[PDB]
């Protein structure tokens, strides 16, 4: 298992990060 982003793939040591990253992929300048 690991924290990656479905929608483009970026992986993240901090789940936080990801969550965070995904909302790049809805609105989040
Ligand atoms: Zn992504």
Do not use: D, G, I, P
């Amino acid at each position: 298992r690991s924290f990656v982003c479905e929608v483009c793939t970026r992986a993240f040591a901090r789940q936080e990060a990801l969550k965070r990253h995904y909302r790049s992929h809805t609105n989040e300048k």
